[PDB]
């Protein structure tokens, strides 16, 4: 549900990401497409090769949505309500895939923030990404 310590941990860790958000978003996506091929089926109209500008520009979208979530954490449901319909109503994304992305987001963050990735912040981010996942799959639940 996110304790006052988690909220504080998530805001600080995201802060250290700053202008790299967009880049990091594209990295998690790439990590997910290669590690979990079964997710590529949702992006036929994308070129999933390494330097893809489509995957590049999409990462910014994903990153900006998380940024929306971090800056409105006390009200994700309403803030991301829009993205919920799009992921549950139109695209019909398998709920499991949100866990796979969340995982890739964590490997990425950890691979760029060696100082900030303490076990406390690690658990914090995980809870947070879980909350974002629950909201995006609520039109299912």
């Amino acid at each position: 549900v996110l304790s006052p310590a988690d909220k504080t941990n998530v805001k600080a860790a995201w802060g250290k990401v700053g202008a790299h958000a967009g880049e990091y978003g594209a990295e998690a996506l790439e990590r997910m497409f290669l590690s979990f091929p079964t997710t590529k089926t949702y992006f036929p109209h994308f070129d999933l090769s390494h330097g893809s500008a489509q995957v590049k520009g999409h990462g910014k979208k994903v990153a900006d949505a998380l940024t929306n979530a971090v800056a409105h954490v006390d009200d994700m449901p309403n803030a991301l309500s829009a993205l919920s319909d799009l992921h549950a109503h139109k695209l019909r994304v398998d709920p499991v895939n949100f866990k796979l992305l969340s995982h890739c987001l964590l490997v990425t963050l950890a691979a760029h923030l060696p100082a900030e990735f303490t076990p406390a912040v690690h658990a914090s981010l995980d809870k947070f990404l879980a909350s974002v996942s629950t909201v995006l799959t609520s039109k299912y639940r």
Binding site: R31, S35, F36, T108, A111, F117, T118, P119, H122, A123
Partner: protein, 146 residues
């Protein structure tokens, strides 16, 4: 547990730089911190009230050592992870009763630790290579459940 020679070279080269002593406990500890329910299987390790206490707990880094032991052991036997683990399988399945879903979790946190330590050197391609291995180790242990 296929692994292309290209993947084989990534897992091997990287794994040979790993500080076995620390990494095993970095994962075990983080598992217990991020997925609390897992603490249920280590009530005897002592105090685990806070991450600080957990990460410093000697029983933890001591066990992590062994856990990491198994991976390297399974890493040099990808050809047959199934048999390499029969013993541990009987152990975690019809003895400890750990739900196989938690084997995926340790494998994923193990992977996060590897990314934390190697940083940039831990490229997406290298990660995908490890996901296969971690996936193969998790299936091997859950075998005695089938």
């Amino acid at each position: 547990v296929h692994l292309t020679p290209e993947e084989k070279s990534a897992v091997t080269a990287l794994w040979g730089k790993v500080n076995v002593d620390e990494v095993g406990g970095e994962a075990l500890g983080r598992l217990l911190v991020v997925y609390p329910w897992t603490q249920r299987f280590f009530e005897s390790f002592g105090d685990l009230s806070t991450p600080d206490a957990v990460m410093g707990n000697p029983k933890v880094k001591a066990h992590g050592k062994k856990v990491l032991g198994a991976f390297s052991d399974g890493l040099a036997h990808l050809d047959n992870l199934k048999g390499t683990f029969a013993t541990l399988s009987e152990l975690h399945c019809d003895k400890l009763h750990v739900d196989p879903e938690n084997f995926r979790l340790l494998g994923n946190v193990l992977v996060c630790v590897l990314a934390h330590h190697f940083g940039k050197e831990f490229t997406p391609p290298v990660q995908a290579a490890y996901q296969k291995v971690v996936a193969g180790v998790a299936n091997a242990l859950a075998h005695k459940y089938h």
